[PDB]
């Protein structure tokens, strides 16, 4: 039936792939903590490509995870920017999804020219409760087949709440 299989948000991950190290990386870092109330983390580049101008381990991007009520309200504050209007092919085949935006100042931080103007990529991890089965240490196990998330489940949920719409396909 449907006693407690209710879908819910795990985590909002906030990503910025600023292509270079140094000051503009530092400023990128100084963007998120205001938005997140939370300190960010920096990821290194794991092999040179020499066309994007990157070396091994020269620390390119910044991303954060947020969960719970603060995560859902910030999600809402992003979907307001995107006017509740998302394309089907954005959705993961597992039931995850995500999108991107530009001009982070179009929400929250006014301009603060010392910081600059940056775009982000939000990505949402979605599931049902009872998920710690795959995450605890003792007696680790996988989730049942019927109990996973799906394209259809997540799009239907996204329909019914936020009363939003999905595009062409």
């Amino acid at each position: 039936q449907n006693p407690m299989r209710d879908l819910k948000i795990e985590k909002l991950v906030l990503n910025i792939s600023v292509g270079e190290s140094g000051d503009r990386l530092t400023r990128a870092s100084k963007v998120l903590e205001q938005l997140s109330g939370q300190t960010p983390v920096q990821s290194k580049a794991r092999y040179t490509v020499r066309t994007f101008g990157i070396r091994r381990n020269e620390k390119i991007a910044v991303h954060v995870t947020v969960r719970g009520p603060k995560a859902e309200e910030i999600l809402e504050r992003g979907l307001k920017v995107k006017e509740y209007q998302l394309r089907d092919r954005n959705f993961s085949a597992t039931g995850n999804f995500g999108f991107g935006i530009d001009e982070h100042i179009d929400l929250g931080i006014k301009y603060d020219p010392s910081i600059g103007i940056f775009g982000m990529d939000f990505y949402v991890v979605m599931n049902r409760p009872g998920a710690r089965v795959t995450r605890r240490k003792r007696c680790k196990g996988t989730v049942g087949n019927s109990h996973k998330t799906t394209k259809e489940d997540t799009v239907s949920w996204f329909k019914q709440k936020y009363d939003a719409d999905v595009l062409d396909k």
């Binding site: 240490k137 003792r138 007696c139 680790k140 196990g141």
Partner: protein, 294 residues
């Protein structure tokens, strides 16, 4: 389609033993535990194992043999009502109580209880059960925490303190007990004594009760129902300790039924296997119906 693993893969798969599949026992731990100095031929190594399940605590004394492991004695949490404890059967003090119980139980059944009395005037101090002069050189046993993660003040080490204060000689340092100062290497005996006697809940009563009555109601509801005051909490633990030191004899339950009755009910209740003749008839019928043009 995608969720399809090849026949070759299935036929070359290795399997973990059984407990690794179940994610239950760390054989790398069991290695360092159960091996005996080969010069000491049959003298078995004894493990005080501790396990924390939801709403219950288990502690046991085990030696190991080829045909299986064998247990000297066991101590569950859920019989502490026999010793005057009715709530919070998973708190760190509950673990201490269980350790004390198992300690005195084993010593009583082994005939060591008169000697190695243990410690009565508990003070949160760190000391080992030293060997009595020219005596029987007290019993020795080592921890077995399983996969449970070690960390400062973890409630398993309450069981360690229970065994130690009971009198078992259990080799251990103290730098993980709650209140082990970190930036400087000392221990706060009185804070430890607080966690022994339920400080973290006795104190926690006050802020919540003077702060948030509905929250103080939903949890600790049983405390209100059975009329326990915060200050009195230390008293019941102290009285328990004497109750254990009085009688650890492990009265077992009476089961109000029979082994056979339980087996019969579950047997008649359970679903059964299907036999080969019926399997053949089943496939034949499936042919004659679905394949047989319905």
């Amino acid at each position: 389609q995608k969720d399809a693993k090849s026949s070759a893969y299935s036929s070359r798969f290795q399997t973990p033993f059984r407990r690794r599949r179940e994610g239950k026992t760390d054989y790398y731990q069991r290695k360092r535990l159960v091996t005996q100095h080969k010069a000491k031929y049959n003298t078995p190594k004894y493990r005080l194992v501790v396990r924390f399940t939801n709403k219950d605590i288990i502690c046991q004394i085990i030696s190991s043999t080829i045909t299986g492991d064998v247990v000297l004695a066991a101590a569950y949490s859920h019989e502490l009502p026999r010793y005057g404890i009715t709530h919070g059967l998973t708190n760190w003090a509950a673990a201490y109580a269980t350790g004390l119980l198992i300690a005195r139980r084993t010593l009583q059944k082994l005939g060591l209880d008169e000697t190695y009395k243990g410690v009565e005037e508990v003070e949160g101090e760190y000391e080992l059960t030293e060997a009595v002069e020219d005596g029987p050189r007290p019993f020795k046993v080592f921890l077995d925490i399983g996969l449970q993660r070690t960390t400062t003040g973890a409630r398993v080490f309450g069981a360690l303190k229970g065994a130690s204060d009971g009198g078992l000689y259990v080799p251990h340092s103290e730098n993980r007990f709650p209140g082990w100062d970190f930036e400087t290497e000392e221990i706060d005996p009185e804070l430890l004594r607080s966690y022994i006697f339920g400080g973290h809940v006795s104190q926690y009563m006050e802020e919540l009760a003077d702060d948030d009555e509905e929250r103080f109601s939903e949890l600790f509801k049983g405390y209100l129902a059975d009329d326990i005051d915060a200050d009195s909490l230390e008293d019941i633990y102290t009285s328990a300790h004497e109750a254990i030191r009085a009688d650890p004899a492990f009265k077992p339950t009476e089961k109000k039924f029979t082994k056979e009755q339980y087996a019969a009910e579950s047997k008649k209740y359970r679903q059964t296997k299907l036999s080969k003749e019926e399997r053949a008839a089943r496939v034949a019928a499936k042919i004659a119906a679905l394949a047989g043009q319905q």
